Amino acid sequence: TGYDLSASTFSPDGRVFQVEYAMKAVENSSTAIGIRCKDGVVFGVEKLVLSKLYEEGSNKRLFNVDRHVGMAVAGLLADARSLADIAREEASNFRSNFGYNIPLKHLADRVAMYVHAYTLYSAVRPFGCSFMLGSYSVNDGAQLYMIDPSGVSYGYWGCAIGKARQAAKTEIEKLQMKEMTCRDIVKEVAKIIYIVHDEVKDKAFELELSWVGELTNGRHEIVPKDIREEAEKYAKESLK
């Protein structure tokens, strides 16, 4: 209510309304959650078909930045694509300059500085994205981070990005998260996404699940979800 025009100006009470408006820009986007286990990180995105015009296999928000790192973006899609390319470039610089895999803390800090640099000046707008970052390493374990539109980047066990941000983490936290391997966590994420919004406002959605950990031996890829088909034979048992 101002004074809301530039991303450089302050308010009479001291905050930037551009950054706030960009934070609640991602609020309208699709619900995307993530959670780690004791030997891996599992992603899951509530993805919706528009009506009947899609192809079930386009524009997947589960990206794949490095050999062991991928994104779980939510928000404006093309801006997230550009940010994913920036992250690929940064992992490229690290691999080219030091000869080994990027630690996830340093990658997240560089990306947070990049997002902050787009929040600073007045020529540019803040990003309209909020994404997840997972990894796994034999000397480091599982690490799950989280980047807001402003650039505040710190770590979680579980998170959620979308409409049901509260309404997922209400029952994310009742998971016994440490003592489970991720092969349980697959159907756990399946049941969590399947709980929120079956048919009420929209018609149909579709599930994607990314998957990194020790079971992939340090690789990051989408699950063979058709293999073991663990959502639906349990999703139909989750309505009662």
């Binding site: 300059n97 000869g99 800090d109």
Partner: protein
């Protein structure tokens, strides 16, 4: 001149002569030929002097900044990669015989070698310097796999002793460095 690096089970052991010469005149009789970069990583140099000093300072810069940003102790292979990039990028002007060694928490003691070209290799032992050909003659004779610390110290003592005795540029006094998980133990021997 003649520099040497030997690893063992616990850690690594380095060594050098001193005798910085120019032509046939000795400019300096005693020299720290090996250089600290991190608290667990050394490098010992040969070739031209100013080149290796400036390269070692810039590597100290980049590695210290990087290792503070990681908030973790650095790797040895990282520093070897830094020397590889900076050596290879200006191979046209530098003459570096940089040998990287050092103990690491994840990987123990390691020895990497970067000669004048800019290639990088991991070795179990290394020579270096213009008067290194001779102990390179018998370093594949006296070496035994799985030495102790004292065997490595005696080994490099005999090595640098014979290299200093024979080569004209080499000589002076023997400086040693022992890098392990515990600490860095330097001493100055003669014999």
């Amino acid at each position: 001149t003649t520099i040497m690096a030997v690893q063992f089970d616990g850690g690594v052991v380095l060594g050098a002569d001193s005798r910085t010469t120019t032509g046939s005149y000795i400019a300096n009789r005693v020299t720290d030929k090996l250089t600290p970069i991190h608290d667990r990583i050394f490098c010992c140099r040969s070739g031209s002097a100013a080149d290796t000093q400036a390269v070692a300072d810039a590597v100290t810069y980049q590695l210290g900044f990087h290792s503070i940003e990681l908030n973790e102790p650095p790797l040895v292979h990282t520093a070897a990669s830094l020397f590889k990039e900076m050596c290879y990028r200006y191979r046209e002007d530098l003459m570096a015989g940089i040998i990287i060694a050092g103990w690491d928490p994840q990987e123990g003691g390691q020895v990497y070698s970067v000669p004048m070209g800019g290639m990088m290799v991991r070795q179990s032992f290394a020579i270096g310097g213009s008067g290194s050909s001779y102990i390179y003659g018998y370093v594949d004779a006296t070496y035994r796999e799985g030495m102790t610390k004292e065997e490595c110290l005696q080994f490099t003592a005999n090595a640098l002793a014979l290299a200093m005795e024979r080569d004209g540029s080499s000589g002076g006094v023997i400086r040693l460095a022992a890098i392990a998980e515990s600490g860095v133990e330097r001493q100055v021997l003669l014999g």
